[PDB]
Amino acid sequence: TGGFNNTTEFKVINNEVYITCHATRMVHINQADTDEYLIFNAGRTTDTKTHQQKLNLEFFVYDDFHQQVMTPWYIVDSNAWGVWMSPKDFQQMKTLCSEISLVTLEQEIDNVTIKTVTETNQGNASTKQFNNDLTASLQVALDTNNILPYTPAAPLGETLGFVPWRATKPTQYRYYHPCYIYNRYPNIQKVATETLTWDAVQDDYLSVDEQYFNFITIENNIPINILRTGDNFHTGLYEFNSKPCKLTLSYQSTRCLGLPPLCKPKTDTTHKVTSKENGADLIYIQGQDNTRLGHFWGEERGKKNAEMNRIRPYNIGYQYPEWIIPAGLQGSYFAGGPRQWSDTTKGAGTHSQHLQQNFSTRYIYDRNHGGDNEVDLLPIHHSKIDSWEEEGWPAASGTHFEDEVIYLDYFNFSGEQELNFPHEVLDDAAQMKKLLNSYQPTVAQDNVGPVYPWGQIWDKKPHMDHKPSMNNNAPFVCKNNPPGQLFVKLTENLTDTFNYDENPDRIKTYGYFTWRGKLVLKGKLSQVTCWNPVKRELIGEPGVFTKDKYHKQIPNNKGNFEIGLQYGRSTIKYIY
Amino acid sequence: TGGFNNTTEFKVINNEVYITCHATRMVHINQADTDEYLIFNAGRTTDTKTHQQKLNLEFFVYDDFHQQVMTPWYIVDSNAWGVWMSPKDFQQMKTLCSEISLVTLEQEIDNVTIKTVTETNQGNASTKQFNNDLTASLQVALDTNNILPYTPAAPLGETLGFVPWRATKPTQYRYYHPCYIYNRYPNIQKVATETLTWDAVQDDYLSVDEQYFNFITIENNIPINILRTGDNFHTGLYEFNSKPCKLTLSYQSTRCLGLPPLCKPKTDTTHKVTSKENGADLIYIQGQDNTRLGHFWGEERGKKNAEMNRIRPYNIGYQYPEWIIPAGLQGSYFAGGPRQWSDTTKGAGTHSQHLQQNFSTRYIYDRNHGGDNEVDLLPIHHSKIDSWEEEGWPAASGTHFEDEVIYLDYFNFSGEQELNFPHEVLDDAAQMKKLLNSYQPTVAQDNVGPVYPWGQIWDKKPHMDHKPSMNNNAPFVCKNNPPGQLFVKLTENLTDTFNYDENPDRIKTYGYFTWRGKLVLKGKLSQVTCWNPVKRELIGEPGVFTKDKYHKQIPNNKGNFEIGLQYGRSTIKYIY
Amino acid sequence: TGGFNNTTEFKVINNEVYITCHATRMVHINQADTDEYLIFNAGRTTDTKTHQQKLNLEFFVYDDFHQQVMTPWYIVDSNAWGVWMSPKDFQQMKTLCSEISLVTLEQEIDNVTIKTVTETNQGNASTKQFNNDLTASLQVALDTNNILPYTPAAPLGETLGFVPWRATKPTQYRYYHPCYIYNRYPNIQKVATETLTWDAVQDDYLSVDEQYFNFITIENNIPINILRTGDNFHTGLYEFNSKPCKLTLSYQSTRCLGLPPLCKPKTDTTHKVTSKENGADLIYIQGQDNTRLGHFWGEERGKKNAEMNRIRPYNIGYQYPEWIIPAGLQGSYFAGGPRQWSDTTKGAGTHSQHLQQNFSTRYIYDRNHGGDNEVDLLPIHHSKIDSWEEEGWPAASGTHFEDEVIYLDYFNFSGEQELNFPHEVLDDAAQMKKLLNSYQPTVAQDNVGPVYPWGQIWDKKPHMDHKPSMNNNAPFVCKNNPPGQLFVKLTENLTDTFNYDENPDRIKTYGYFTWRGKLVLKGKLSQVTCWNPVKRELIGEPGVFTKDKYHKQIPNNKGNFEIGLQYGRSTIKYIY
């Protein structure tokens, strides 16, 4: 119990499943470059001026500019799926459960081991001796009240590593210092056409306001614990309050809600639905084509209605303009959009990449977060980072094809004479692609579920009058405050000569400690009602045909392997 | 207790603060011009026709047209912040509390004093004698069930006065009679270009439908109390059910949510954040520029991502087109928009007024509601009314610069070759300024908080299927029905000769009474976590430099002074 | 609890506020140059003789001469405001409380970590190895009876540092050995005019008397505790007995005590008090100018009295000659004077610096006591020390303009004929500036309150027949003996070769330990009675206009920042 445990156990009692995840890591820690708190601006870029050419797009989307408070502390951040479960474990949960819910979280720290480094230069140096420092200390701070600004580490891909038998690193704690107004290319609309004079304007604009300085330290707000060799620290028992998350996906749109029309099967010939042929024809009124007994949108033009204007209870998904970037106080940002899953739209760039598949997402990760240490084929030697394309497949229900929207003004007509397109329908659809937000209160939207390994498990809600109902990063949002962030630091180890200036003179020191945590999940046995057997794995891009993906799922002779993406919502189910 | 009490007491018990506000006013009342209920149309305006010039904008935005039920009664309306607190008191609450909540409300009426006026003409008249009428009565009606349509008096700037030692007036009770359809400039789109014939169309359009007559009187619905000299009336104890309102503002946008990038401070040179220089530079992967390990929007173009497409949990604020007026049944109206706070956008009208600062607001008020009796420098002599510009400073978090929005269609590219703007980006942004609604379920919006003195404290929610989540006028919205409206009237005092026609022959009569009320507030001690001292006052426009504002905060030799604006949300805090 | 805690909590119970201040520091300690007690004279200076020029003033005011007992021990001195509170915390207390009082003090020492230094010379030396010495000891002595002479360390600006996350140093313990008589320029009045012969006299005079030797050691008087690694030391619970200190300042003088004259406001014209015009005129008796019904000083000259000779209950402040230095046994010293706050006296050096603002004070401090590490703009490179000018603003009530005093001999006259100045009034005022002490039993004087960060919190009263009622350094004076001084020392760590001579042969040794303390304050909720909102910040010299002060309140990219001055008494209130 006082030692390494990384295991999962599945237990079913009341027809509820209980998932207990044990995780343990060896955490290697170094001392920060200073013991000071630091506050600085970083990322302001001056483009290379072309007033005779044109303004630079690359300069526009690559701003990293921000202002930052950098602290001597480090976060131990366990919030990602890859920390708590192996690939088998996540498949197990994915198969057993129809839905899951967070129950409770525990974590502790012990096995503090600190050493000092001595370097004597003999034979042109390159000699290091390592000695235990038995009185050296590790400082631990738990913020249970969430005083400090909340910084989940999964979106930057730096958390505890995903492999239980490798050592891992904490990340240094830092947070934004939103005291400023920043904008890049101000007055974009004051350049006349193209290069009439200069097409580079002012570059950026910046103003900092001392009014807004908010500078928060750990030492003032939180009590700090000091741990030597035999010491240990326990966070306590945290309880999640949050709603359950379904593990099923639906492939269903507005056209599929409710009763289908009544049809008469074709008796003469035989068809399968994959043959893409009519196997039946509709039964209309008195044999009169297009005449149905419904509830429909519009006015009667002669009483011809179809499956298209049949009134539906709800709208599934909504049309939203793709890649709009608004400008906030502190910079311009991608607004994103409703997650959708598209594939195989014939046109545009033809068959190569098709479209972005609506609002597409990439994960980019290193060796310890599930990358094979080699970049996948199609100055450093090659590259050590891997990436994955997360296309939103569980969200397929509400996907919309942005090119295909049609606008009609008068749909009905006072007579049955004819129905023709206006000659502006083509142009009017192009405008409607980029400018149309179809969201309304009849819309039902479905987010992507848990994403493995790299997805964030839980997140904090913002403190605001109008609260958002959805979250891009995480399937679980805490109603109350989230689990407290866990900060760790090496005690300053000083030489005999005290420095009165900024940076202290220190003995070179490092250590490692054991992080151990327990995460408890509650779920419900999956009940699948279909006759046919179910396929729970997204296919079309495995290593089965010449993609060599699944070959890389186990270690090689060097010990390198990579972890594949898995969606928590893998099972088909009817909504409505 | 049976007498004048206007005081506030702050009391802290459980680490909760209790704020008890006592308010008392002398209320001068007159008898209405008739004892009848009146129903009329008012405000229809015929413009001066230019068919040879152009249609008049001034005629368009200045419609006051409405239909109205005017009643003999008067409202005693205490719902504004300036009624219950002094400028010191509101600063006190603003400093002590992190949030506040409404607890309970009591109010009563006594000290009824009624007089009659006799005028004898001697020496060309101008002589008035005043006599007590000891049997005269004041009628009081409390609508506890909210039968009558709800008409908060703060938006028209007429409530009980804000100064405790001045006498004040009630306002006469009236309400809209929505039986009609009204529109001004119908068929605006049927004029061809400019003045091809006549550019003034039909002016307005009006239709009244007897179907919709709803005419409600106090006498049928509510029991009425009669008060003579020694009598007194008590409303009882009302209990608010509503959510708390935070007293903190955030200056934070989407770019500032979560972990900042890891950076390395510059060791050679020294900078302060106000110097607007880089104090550090980012650490990229393998020194390869723009390469980060993230979670990002889009497809990999060669794996260059930045702080701009970094996926964020939420969107803070949203882009909404500014100054759109839709046309409802009973007229066209300004839709408003999400409250924002802008300043210092270089461009457009240059430095003078900059923009509207997004959705700007004005208060316009008289001497008793906190105006100095003189209009501020830059047919009546001068003007006695003052105004204040409420620019939405507590809402700064979600402000957007409408000119700066960018639209990209294909952000990703199948190769790393180049990224260039399309030549339509400039035009396509102009369209997107006026037509784009970026609202979606990931948006978090923050309203302006309590506004002092002129802001409304509480308000009623509409009885509707889809209820609104935000309110422009008031920080507190009652889940159940709001406090009952308090109606007051002088009993008809008739001469000896009874009139059988419309308006009664009355003895000229007036009186005054004492209104007294108690408002209880609950709050939580403010906990500020920053190192630096906090600045709780909005500056940049005080009387400190040559604005002579704070000089006017205390009475002059005439007793005139004016009350300055104060935001309830004055303290900076991190959301998320 | 056995670890780092630096936090403050504000708690309100009985309508009393309780302020608990937690403070913790890492204290770096070195071994003193000797283990001996040392007694020496220091500071005697021989001026460069000009008998042909004139005696040197610089030589006069720069004497540091003293006799001193220097001890091997070190003081841990927490007595300053900057130790116990952050800038936010002090503002909080300043805003919440009308007055404060000291309750109790606790402090302890643990986390003793001692190391030895070994230096091997290889590659021209410059190599240090650091080893734990696990049996080495720290000696701790608490003087609970105040046997040793009391030496508060704030006036020399050396106490524990003000920043909680920086390491800090103790100061070595030393005290005056008052056995001697010292005087500089004896017989200053025996030089005839200027340089009649030699204008440098005898320089100084000195005599030491063995009669008065008082030489006190820690080892004889106090029991000493020995602490190794796991050990800890607790002082116990100390209880303050002292009177409360108000947190309000008054701006009020003798002219403002009591009833003003009755006046009649001007009805024709309008004025504000900042316009500096009469808004009313006085009502005299029977319209007879200057005739009032009073209680006045003097004899009736014809019964014309004014607001100037109106008898007042008290005198607020008193006139005292500024910069007189008396000569005591052990040297000449500045006597100081009643604290006053002056500004804007037109004359003398005109507008540049005006006067000293009466008895002015400077603080001079280093980086760890709140200095930015750079000296403020307007052989070492530049200078690392900062200074602040403390001008006595809370004491403004009793300030006097020393140039403006008038002396009359016969004020009254046996007739109404005329009142004229004597021709000597001008000269007689000049004499009265330098020689006049106006103190008397009707005087009410008000000291400066708490001063942040650098002010001393508490102090000891002298053991004397006539005790002083005021203290220049500290707002709190203990009636009983003050908290005991806490002495700390490294145990002598000796080599194998024992030295029989004066200074011992030691292993080079240093350590650090944790100092932790808890200070409890009691206060009363501030009750402000004014209508207008209150301004609690001294302005006219912030960084708001081009002074860049508040910009420096948060760390830069190097971690340097400075702490601004704050007066405990920031709120205006009427005395009397």
The tokens of C547 are what? 């002074």
Strand partners, B115: B132, B510
**Of C307, C317, C299, C324, nearest to C408 (Cα)?**
C299
- Given a contact as 3+ CB pairs under 8 Å, which chains touch A? B, C
Cβ atoms A24, A514 nearer than 8 A: yes
CA torsion, ordered A150, A155, A156, A159, to nearest 10 deg: 80
Check if A290 contacts B (Cβ < 8 Å). Answer: no
Count of residues in chain C: 576
Residues in chain B preceding a C-to-N separation beyond 2.5 angstroms (breaks): 378
For B22-57, the DSSP string reads EEEEEEEEE--S-SS-EEEEE---PPPP-SSS---H
Strand partners, B140: B225, B488
C453 prior amide bond cis, ω within 30: yes
Contact criterion met (CB < 8 Å) for A36 and C554 = no
**Of A42, A57, A476, A9, nearest to A243 (Cα)?**
A476
Angle at C181 between CA C175 and CA C182, to 5 degrees: 90
User: Which helix (H) or strand (E) covers residue C60, if one does?
Assistant: helix C57-61
CA distance A385 to A370: 10
Contact criterion met (CB < 8 Å) for C557 and B271 = yes
**Of C472, C477, C486, C475, nearest to C459 (Cα)?**
C477
Chain B residues whose beta carbon lies within 8 Å of the beta carbon of residue A33: 265
CA distance C194 to C190: 11
Contact criterion met (CB < 8 Å) for A187 and B346 = yes
Q: Rounded to a whole number, what is the distance in Å from the CA of C363 to chain B's nearest CA?
A: 21
Chain B residues whose beta carbon lies within 8 Å of the beta carbon of residue C566: 533
The tokens of A411 are what? 């749909």
User: Which helix (H) or strand (E) covers residue B264, if one does?
Assistant: strand B263-265
Look at residue B471 and give its three-state secondary structure: coil
Place of tokens 């007995």: C241
Cβ atoms C187, C31 nearer than 8 A: no
Cβ atoms A160, A78 nearer than 8 A: yes
CA distance B470 to B147: 24
State how far the alpha carbon of B412 is from the alpha carbons of A329, A457, B309, B545, in Å: 26, 28, 11, 52
The tokens of C421 are what? 């100045």
* Residue B234, phi then psi, degrees to nearest 5: -120, 125
C186 prior amide bond cis, ω within 30: no
**Of C524, C458, C487, nearest to C105 (Cα)?**
C458
Check if C167 contacts A (Cβ < 8 Å). Answer: yes
Look at residue B357 and give its three-state secondary structure: coil
Strands (E), B63-203: 66-76, 97-119, 128-132, 138-143, 171-176, 180-184
Q: Give residue A182's identity as a one-letter amino acid code.
A: Y
Instruction: Give burial (CB, 10 Å; 0-12/13-18/19+) of B521.
Output: buried
The experimental technique used to determine this model is: cryo-EM
Look at residue A393 and give its three-state secondary structure: helix
**Of A451, A389, A391, A512, nearest to A85 (Cα)?**
A451
The tokens of C456 are what? 């001393």
Chain B residues whose beta carbon lies within 8 Å of the beta carbon of residue A190: 347
**Of B68, B213, B230, B220, nearest to B136 (Cα)?**
B230
Strand partners, C41: C67
Cβ atoms C244, C101 nearer than 8 A: yes
* Residue B83, phi then psi, degrees to nearest 5: -75, -40
Cβ atoms B568, B448 nearer than 8 A: no
Q: Are strands A280-282 and B361-365 parallel, antiparallel or unpaired?
A: unpaired
The tokens of B78 are what? 């205490």
CA distance A482 to A143: 10
Q: Rounded to a whole number, what is the distance in Å from the CA of B102 to chain C's nearest CA?
A: 21
The tokens of A509 are what? 């020191």
Look at residue C218 and give its three-state secondary structure: helix
User: Which helix (H) or strand (E) covers residue A459, if one does?
Assistant: strand A458-460
Look at residue A443 and give its three-state secondary structure: strand
CA distance C290 to C288: 7
A85 CB-near residues (< 8 Å, 6+ apart)? A8, A21, A93, A452
* Residue A282, phi then psi, degrees to nearest 5: -70, 155
Cβ atoms A460, A146 nearer than 8 A: yes
Residues in chain C preceding a C-to-N separation beyond 2.5 angstroms (breaks): 378
- Give the HSE-up count for residue C12: Cα atoms under 13 Å, Cβ half-sphere: 20
Look at residue A531 and give its three-state secondary structure: coil
| Chain B residue with Cα closest to C556 | B272
Check if B180 contacts A (Cβ < 8 Å). Answer: no
**Of A266, A144, A169, nearest to A512 (Cα)?**
A169
Residues in chain A preceding a C-to-N separation beyond 2.5 angstroms (breaks): 378
Check if B268 contacts C (Cβ < 8 Å). Answer: no
Cβ atoms C571, C534 nearer than 8 A: yes
Q: Are strands A171-176 and B8-12 parallel, antiparallel or unpaired?
A: unpaired
Q: Give residue C414's identity as a one-letter amino acid code.
A: S
Check if B575 contacts A (Cβ < 8 Å). Answer: yes
Q: Which of A157, A361, A454 sits opposite B297 (nearest CB)?
A: A361
The tokens of A486 are what? 């866990």
Look at residue B341 and give its three-state secondary structure: coil
State how far the alpha carbon of A539 is from the alpha carbons of A55, A85, A360, A544, in Å: 43, 22, 18, 9
Q: Which of B88, B92, B533 sits opposite C87 (nearest CB)?
A: B533
CA distance B308 to C175: 63
CA distance B424 to B421: 8
- Given a contact as 3+ CB pairs under 8 Å, which chains touch B? A, C
- Give the HSE-up count for residue A135: Cα atoms under 13 Å, Cβ half-sphere: 22
The tokens of A129 are what? 């001796």
CA distance A40 to B280: 7
Cα Rg, chain A, nearest whole Å: 29
Calculate the CA C514 to chain-centre distance. 28
Q: Rounded to a whole number, what is the distance in Å from the CA of C9 to chain B's nearest CA?
A: 9
Check if C547 contacts A (Cβ < 8 Å). Answer: no
Biggest distance spanned by C-alpha atoms of chain B = 104
- Which stretches within B376-515 are classed as H helix? 425-435
Check if B541 contacts A (Cβ < 8 Å). Answer: no
Task: Work out the number of other CB atoms within 10 angstroms of the CB of residue C475.
Answer: 25
CA distance A418 to A391: 42
Strands (E), C314-425: 315-316, 327-328, 331-332, 361-365, 386-390
Strand partners, A477: A459
Look at residue C39 and give its three-state secondary structure: strand
B453 prior amide bond cis, ω within 30: yes
The tokens of C552 are what? 């420096």
**Of B13, A209, A291, A290, nearest to C550 (Cα)?**
A209
State how far the alpha carbon of C427 is from the alpha carbons of C140, C322, C433, in Å: 63, 18, 10
Instruction: Give burial (CB, 10 Å; 0-12/13-18/19+) of B4.
Output: middle
CA distance C150 to C152: 6
Check if A419 contacts B (Cβ < 8 Å). Answer: no
* Residue B428, phi then psi, degrees to nearest 5: -65, -20
CA distance C416 to A419: 114
CA distance A196 to C270: 59
Cβ atoms C259, C311 nearer than 8 A: no
Angle at B355 between CA B349 and CA B360, to 5 degrees: 150
| Chain C residue with Cα closest to A507 | C130
Task: Work out the number of other CB atoms within 10 angstroms of the CB of residue C131.
Answer: 13
* Residue C453, phi then psi, degrees to nearest 5: -75, -20
Q: Give residue C503's identity as a one-letter amino acid code.
A: N
* Residue C98, phi then psi, degrees to nearest 5: -85, -30
CA torsion, ordered B545, B549, B550, B552, to nearest 10 deg: 140
User: Which helix (H) or strand (E) covers residue C88, if one does?
Assistant: helix C87-96
Check if B348 contacts C (Cβ < 8 Å). Answer: no
CA distance B39 to B212: 14
CA distance C174 to C176: 7
CA distance B398 to B395: 6
CA distance B573 to B566: 18
Chain B residues whose beta carbon lies within 8 Å of the beta carbon of residue C87: 531-533
Cβ atoms A214, B530 nearer than 8 A: yes
Which DSSP letter does residue C168 get?
B
Sign, Cα dihedral of B251, B253, B258, B263: negative
Check if B243 contacts A (Cβ < 8 Å). Answer: no
CA torsion, ordered A527, A533, A539, A544, to nearest 10 deg: 130
State how far the alpha carbon of B173 is from the alpha carbons of B29, B75, B330, B517, in Å: 13, 6, 21, 20
Contact criterion met (CB < 8 Å) for A220 and C164 = yes
3-state helix, strand, coil in chain B (%, to 5): 10, 30, 60
Q: Give residue B81's identity as a one-letter amino acid code.
A: W
Q: Give residue B145's identity as a one-letter amino acid code.
A: N
The tokens of B292 are what? 């980060």
Which DSSP letter does residue A403 get?
G
Which DSSP letter does residue B149 get?
P
Cβ atoms C157, C365 nearer than 8 A: yes
Check if B246 contacts A (Cβ < 8 Å). Answer: yes
Best C8, C113, C382, C493 member to test A by mutation, with max A CBs in 10 Å, is C113
Long-range contacts of A364-368 (CB under 8 A, 24+ apart): A364/A157, A364/B292, A364/B293, A364/B294, A364/B295, A364/B296, A364/B300, A364/B303, A364/B305, A365/A157, A365/A454, A365/B293, A366/A157, A366/B293, A367/A560, A368/A161, A368/A162, A368/A163, A368/A166, A368/A168
CA distance A75 to A171: 6
Cβ atoms B68, B176 nearer than 8 A: yes
Check if B99 contacts A (Cβ < 8 Å). Answer: no
The tokens of C120 are what? 């091997």
Chain B residues whose beta carbon lies within 8 Å of the beta carbon of residue A158: 293
Task: Work out the number of other CB atoms within 10 angstroms of the CB of residue C333.
Answer: 11
CA distance A554 to B284: 29
Cβ atoms B280, B264 nearer than 8 A: yes
For A33-99, the DSSP string reads S-SS-EEEEE---PPPP-SSS---HHHHHT---EEEEEEEEEEE---SHHHH--HHHHHHHHHHEEE
Strands (E), B283-430: 295-297, 315-316, 327-328, 331-332, 361-365, 386-390, 406-407
